Design a protein around this ligand. Sequence first.
Ligand code: SF4
Ligand code: SF4
Ligand code: NA
Length: 284
Amino acid sequence: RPLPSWLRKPLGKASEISTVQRLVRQYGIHTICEEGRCPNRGECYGQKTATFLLLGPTCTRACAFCQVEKGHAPAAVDPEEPTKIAAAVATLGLRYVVLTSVARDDLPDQGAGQFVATMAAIRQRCPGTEIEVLSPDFRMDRGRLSQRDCIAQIVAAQPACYNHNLETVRRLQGPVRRGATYESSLRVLATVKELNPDIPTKSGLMLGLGETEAEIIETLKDLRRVGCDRLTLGQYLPPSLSHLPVVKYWTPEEFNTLGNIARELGFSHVRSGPLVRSSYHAAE
Ligand code: SF4
Ligand code: SF4
Ligand code: NA
């Protein structure tokens, strides 16, 4: 499984990004871009986009693919996080913002209010900035606000796009994800369309975890059945030796081919390639 050529070059490239790095730390908030040293930073920062991580910076779930730092207990909730993010968005002059969060099984609203508050803070401070949500599944809802109502709170704030990743095919949901299921994640996407069919929905998979093309294609059809508009396909790269190994490096050609299959199946926006991530070119 050594690193293929098409990946060594872009994974070793560095760009001028220091102002952004400094501001994020200074304002006391966290981005996926920085928490994972994303190889797309030069391009995204250049396009005035970033992905902020709410309710962390650690997660307790420890999904075997995920780059978020593992935490011993739920991160204390910062009531000023929404305002601080909006201030960063303003000073960075971002045009397109993706909001995501860690899973918060411990909170009565599963953290859904934090999304709503952050969206409100950004709208009141930053004119023209669009906001995409990369949502948790909100599935652990016994005695909580229901999965449906968590989604509804966010849908009510009219994101530019509602993204919820399946991450992998049905067969691999067990080993790849913790606390998630295939049907629950598809239900997130369907629920958004029930609540407001005008909100674009998006999902994504990471390839290289042992899925086959046959299984990928079935998953694409499953996504179109719940009216998923947008798709990202990217290469799984283990964040550390403790994470799942890469089974396969999918070639640029294979990503192109699958990209085109997805377009034929009616996805209206598709990004497919080795360094593609959920937020990559999200602004379109
Ligand atoms: S791909 Fe996503 S995570 Fe990476 S730099 Fe762009 S916005 Fe940040
Ligand atoms: S995928 Fe979500 S739940 Fe799993 S570790 Fe990452 S942040 Fe936590
Ligand atoms: Na992302």
